[PDB]
Amino acid sequence: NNIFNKYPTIIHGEARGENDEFVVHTRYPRFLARKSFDDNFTGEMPAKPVNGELGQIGEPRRLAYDSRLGLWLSDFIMLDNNKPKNMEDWLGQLKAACDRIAADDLMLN
Amino acid sequence: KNNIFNKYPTIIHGEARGENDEFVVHTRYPRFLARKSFDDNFTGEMKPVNGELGQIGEPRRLAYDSRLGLWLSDFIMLDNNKPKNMEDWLGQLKAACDRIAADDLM
Amino acid sequence: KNNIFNKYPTIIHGEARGENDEFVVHTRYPRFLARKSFDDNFTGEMKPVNGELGQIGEPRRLAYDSRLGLWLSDFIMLDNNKPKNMEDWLGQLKAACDRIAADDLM
Amino acid sequence: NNIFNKYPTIIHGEARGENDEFVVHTRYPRFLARKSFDDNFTGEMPAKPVNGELGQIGEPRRLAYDSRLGLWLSDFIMLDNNKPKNMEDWLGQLKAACDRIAADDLMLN
């Protein structure tokens, strides 16, 4: 409810005995995601704002965000109850949140 | 969402830019998001953790006191299961807090 | 069941053969079944009711103290709505108890 | 859960400014019902054990128990979550509970 807005928008996460990291987005659309990094990740801010892409990968096909910078978000768990009135609209907002989270992780110093 | 949480580690310790407090997600029952807070004189070394749930202060909110310097508050429940029996429900919420408290002393 | 409760009066005061304590059903949010208990020196005449929720005694259970002689305990929640925000949830549970307390002084 | 079994099996209810009464059954099958009385109700124990009947009445058709003694139970709200494996089996157990509640109301003195 209002209660999520007591929290910061982006929470960056970590668990013991785990190499992947974690993120919580507390504004709409709200979610818990797994944050991972591949070989093309270096951690530095790119010249142009983060412009990732979000799509289905793996078998079975599950939604994934690729920052195109080596940072991935995956295993999304939606924390709101709502059915999006428009899927493309909802996908667009999820991606914007994801770009913001990716950019936030790089500024995390 | 009932079981998707099980792909996640039980306890996720979190942080946020510009914030002093910390954050936890508990991904087993009962699942929740909470704020991690700390006393000034919080040592961190180690009887097993026996905290307690309570409504503290005059802000009228539910907090958890580890009694070892760590607090959990602003509890957001994430499960979809209705708990009729409150008996399990606060006890298990306090039991999970005692685990988050131990796991964070590290 | 989400709304069928609305065909019922908000507060149902109950009794049972062979039992000293009494019983209440609250049929609006938050909906619950509870046990009504009484101090020995409970007068019953009448500031509006401002009780408090608490975990009392060493039995580790959630009770409500009207502070006017009436208690509610053994809370069984009956709603099907998940309350993420605990902030409303205990406050409203305590607000409903303050109403059951006033309504039973009669 | 176990928590219902802290309560007595049958709770007889009343509300302010209401003429109908109310009942909670705390054993399986668990429910909240409205308890009403018609003109053939006198309140005394009949010679043979209560043998009511349970059926659909009104428009729309909603489940009702008639004690055949003037006591009715209606507006059932089921308090358990389960789907009965067998409807006739479940109906049978609901009626037995209802006979027991009816008989309990008469002994309530």
UniProtKB/TrEMBL annotation, chains B, C:
<protein>
    <submittedName>
        <fullName>Uncharacterized protein</fullName>
    </submittedName>
</protein>
